[PDB]
Symmetry: C2
Subunit: 58 residues, 2 copies
């Protein structure tokens, strides 16, 4: 529920993504996963949260 970086798994890919409370109206969902590679995805269960939010080192 907090904006930040998290380890997630999406289609078998373990990766770090950024989470924002972005609103996506197609049905409307709040929560967006910003990935390092690939299009953003709504927080609708396709991606599963493994850990986070990660504490930044500075």
């Amino acid at each position: 529920m907090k904006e930040g970086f998290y380890w997630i798994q999406h289609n078998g890919r373990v990766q770090v993504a950024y989470y924002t409370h972005g609103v996506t109206e197609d049905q409307t969902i709040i929560g967006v996963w910003h990935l390092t590679q690939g299009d953003d995805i709504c927080h609708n269960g396709e991606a599963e949260i493994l850990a986070g939010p990660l504490e930044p080192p500075i």
Copy 2:
């Protein structure tokens, strides 16, 4: 050095980005090459699984 996720600072923004052979894949914004604009703070991060 090795491909993986790293904490970097780019334009004052602390963030995790993916490094591949030298290019930085950022969560928001266009990819940027490793030319000194982005400074590596820590990594590569060990995945939890």
